[PDB]
Amino acid sequence: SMGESRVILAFGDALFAGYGLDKGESYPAKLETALRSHGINARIINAGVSGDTTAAGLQRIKFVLDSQPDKPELAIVELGGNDLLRGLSPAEARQNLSGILEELQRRKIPILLMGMRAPPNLGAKYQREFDGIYPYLAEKYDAKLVPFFLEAVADRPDLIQKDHVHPTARGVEELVSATSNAVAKALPA
Length: 189
What we know:
Pfam families: Lipase_GDSL_2. The protein is an alpha/beta fold and 189 residues long. The chain is built from eight helices and five strands; from the N terminus they run E-H-H-E-H-E-H-H-E-H-H-E-H. The chain is elongated, with a radius of gyration of 20 Å.
């Protein structure tokens, strides 16, 4: 092909940073290679930051854009999962994401929004509220939406890293049954 590469900003959290993966295995790196098969030579800026909430993303979006030598021709925004993990307000996550998309739209950078989905642990009221923020934002900011970014691994535990292991309430009872003898013995009589 002739010419310089197309510049894409991947603005996200651990799912873009490649947490737990080797060099070149992250989603931005592998997406860059896959776009070759669409006739596209892209340079994807990996602006994933592990642990970033929507507020953290809002705090740095201007800095990240102002730091680029080449203005992004597309910005892919993937945030909200860490708000989920902290049980944070879905309303505030929507507001923070709105601020991010507003900055991109001000600069006339096209947007692809990666939809996040809440697990049932947070309850149906929270889950419905959280899930709905992404179609709302995509419509409001004329962004293209991937409705469920992790859909392709949702039924594939073999494609998910083993890392955090937080027991459920029933799992806690299991651990208590297994370890209470040791605690009782360790406590002086």
